[PDB]
Symmetry: C3
Subunit: 225 residues, 3 copies
């Protein structure tokens, strides 16, 4: 749905690459899969937004009013740029599917929610594929599998399926350092409980955002000129 994006931000999605400066521009103020865990965080009791929730909320609003986002995990990111291709190939070789690239996908025209898949699979699944920074974390995944994977990571996988209207996702790891056994993955199925969470909470988050922008005099989208 390029025309929309284009009309909206003057950017041509096709030309984009994970890391592209545009890539980044397109994510500004947007609720993404990597960060949604924060949005759904709940107080043990009470209705009060947890801290990690207020904090994400505050981060998002600033992206809107400043038009920038600070950089994080430089070396981690770099590690990943470094090995993604090898990881991809192998994964394929091994999983038996062909993977193809996916720009960035928004849920709808509002452009308030999105995900950036690591790939789109021949069998119809999306792909999340990490090159953990510490071999310690690969071990953790490799041995514990599913129940090893973190909540923050489960929310991520689920939110991608919510945005793309998909039913299953691969969650894989790669570590070029392992003498053998360097690639591990699993398949995750869409879970309606998560679905229902998003449907309920995400829209509520968006409305508060707008209220706040209004209080201080901005409007969602200014970040895109």
């Amino acid at each position: 749905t390029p025309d929309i994006i284009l009309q909206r931000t003057g950017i041509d999605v096709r030309a984009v690459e994970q890391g592209d400066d545009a890539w980044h521009k397109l994510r500004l103020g947007v609720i993404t899969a990597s960060e949604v865990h924060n949005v759904i965080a709940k107080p043990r009791s009470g209705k009060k937004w947890p801290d990690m929730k207020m904090s994400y909320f505050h981060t998002l609003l600033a992206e809107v009013c400043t038009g920038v986002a600070p950089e994080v995990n430089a070396k981690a990111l770099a590690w990943g740029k470094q090995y993604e291709n090898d990881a991809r190939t192998l994964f394929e070789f091994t999983s038996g599917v062909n993977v193809t690239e996916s720009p960035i996908i928004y849920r709808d025209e509002s452009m308030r929610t999105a995900c950036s898949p690591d790939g789109l699979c021949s069998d119809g699944n999306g792909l999340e594929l990490k090159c953990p920074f510490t071999s310690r974390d690969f071990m953790k995944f490799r041995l514990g599998g599913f129940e090893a994977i973190k909540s923050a990571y489960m929310a991520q996988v689920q939110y991608s399926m919510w945005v793309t209207r998909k039913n299953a996702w691969y969650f894989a790891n790669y570590d070029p350092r392992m003498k053998r056994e360097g690639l591990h993955y699993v398949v995750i199925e869409r879970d309606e409980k998560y679905m229902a969470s998003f449907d309920e909470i995400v829209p509520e988050f968006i409305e508060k955002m707008d209220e706040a922008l209004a209080e201080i005099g901005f409007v969602f989208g200014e970040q895109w000129r």
Copy 2:
């Protein structure tokens, strides 16, 4: 007794009037002293008991060590640098917005003892002091902007109250500045003096000083060696 430039100059060789925030002198003048930025640690209390809390012990060791080494390490240089860089920008936008005039004030000691002090971001024409933060992250600016007072963390309140205790003023402005903000990059509030804090300082601080004196003697140092 009342602190004078004359006293600082003779004890440390430094000319207060030439000092500028972040200067080398500015740093030296703070070695070993209980500052508003850190007092929060001094007044910390255990849930029950009388035992000094970890944060408290910890700042105690820190202060002592400044006395016996005469130096202090740097932390989060980046944020430090950030705050140091945007300060002037912040001051002048505050003057415009509040309408008051601001004067600069290095460091101010509570008395001739040189044990307690603060470094205001300015002194206002209406008699109030000024504290200007340039949060390193915009997220923080947004937090305050939207949350105001109640947004401001305890440490900040103690810092603001101690500045008033040291200088004997009745109110203080607290502001935030973010140069990255397209517009509206300055927000601020006014904090009034609070006796409950005054009192606490009055009781606790003096005691903290004595403990320090005891520990230094024990390893044969005397307060002040840092300005040698």
Copy 3:
């Protein structure tokens, strides 16, 4: 059975006598091994329940990764460089003061299994082991200087006992040096072997080892592949 240079040489290709702390081999020899500095993690317990604590599972993963990759990431680099810079001056000063003469002892295994080791700061004329740190912050230095024994972090204690467990000794020196102190930049104590602790390693360690073993087999590895 006891460890000997021949084993090492035969199993890994390395000349143990030739090893220097921080040597490439020095590092090689530590891969997959449970050391004195990390043991605190293995001994860690949950307030209740028999479930491993987060730090335990973590170290546990870290070590397995060491076995399957044959490498280890670089860590706490600033702290290591600092200690590296002062270890000499610290030793010399300790010697003078304690009277003892100190000798280098690369690394030592508890046994031929090569699963357990330590790398003492030195070996003392009086047959005591030596742990000599250059704390990164002067604050920690002060902490110990003033509070001695009861001030030493659990982890440091574990590291100490682990070392006696490994070498089979009765006492060890725990000392600190701070080149920053204008005076009194050296302080130390003498720690006695504690049986409650020995029992502990004696019990836990072995189970930890069994578990690594299960886990590795589950993914087709066997301990020692790191030295291939």
